[PDB]
Amino acid sequence: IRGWIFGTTLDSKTQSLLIVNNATNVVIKVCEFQFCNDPFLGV
């Protein structure tokens, strides 16, 4: 587990929270993200 994504539609036309732990720092953003159907990282 690395992060969480919060919102209502979890797609564009609205804002959505994204928290992600990379390896030494957590990045938190609230952009109007266009999430994928099955989002994940490419470690």
Next chain:
Amino acid sequence: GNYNYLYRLFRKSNLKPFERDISTEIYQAGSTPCNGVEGFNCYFPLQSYG
């Protein structure tokens, strides 16, 4: 006339405290779904100050 300042004119519910809504989804004021198409009873929720 300066129209750079906007305000939301319609919304399905009132904002909670310190809530921010920047969505530009077309507000369906009637019973006809808008499907993202503006027209009769389908309005842009934002309006410019005069």
